[PDB]
């Protein structure tokens, strides 16, 4: 799993379209990240699931800081950052497309947490 499915829901989008402002507003809504409070910042990873869960073994990951793992390979990512004063709907978002490695925490060989610090920014 429920953590892993929760991670995929919040942080995985396989084959994005556009990755502009409007991609962010729409995918943030669709995935339940603005229903009560506007989530301030969120990053989506793109490409295949198998490369992401492979960060959990030595194949595509290294130990990182305290209980984290860092990918050896780079991923296409989209950071959605809240723009405006209030945390309340309606939520307006700026997209930042990038290409770099990711930091995750793994549980029982699956990714369950994305470190957002590396995307703040």
Curated annotation (Swiss-Prot):
Q: Per its record, what are the GO molecular function terms?
A: actin binding; copper ion binding; DNA binding; endonuclease activity; heparin binding; peptide binding; protein homodimerization activity; receptor ligand activity
Localization per Swiss-Prot or TrEMBL: Secreted; Nucleus; Nucleus, Nucleolus; Cytoplasm, Stress granule
Q: Can you supply one Gene Ontology CC term for this chain's record?
A: cytosol
Swapping residue 116 to A/G leads to an effect described as:
Strongly increased ribonuclease activity
Effect recorded for residue 43 to A: Decreased ribonuclease activity
- How does the record describe its quaternary structure? Homodimer. Interacts with RNH1; inhibiting ANG ribonuclease activity. Interacts with PCNA.
> What is the name of the protein in this document?
Angiogenin
Which portion of the complete protein is shown here? 27 to 146 of 147
């Amino acid at each position: 799993n429920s953590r892993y499915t929760h991670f995929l829901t919040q942080h995985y989008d396989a084959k994005p379209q556009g990755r502009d402002d409007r991609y962010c507003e729409s995918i943030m809504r669709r995935r339940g990240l603005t229903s009560d409070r506007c989530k301030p910042i969120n990053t989506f990873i793109h490409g295949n699931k198998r490369s992401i869960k492979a960060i959990c073994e030595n194949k595509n990951g290294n130990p990182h800081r305290e209980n984290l793992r860092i990918s050896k390979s780079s991923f296409q990512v989209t950071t959605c950052k809240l723009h405006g004063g209030s945390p309340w709907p309606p939520c307006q978002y700026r997209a930042t497309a990038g290409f770099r490695n990711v930091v995750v925490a793994c549980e029982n060989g699956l990714p369950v947490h994305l470190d957002q610090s590396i995307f703040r920014r």
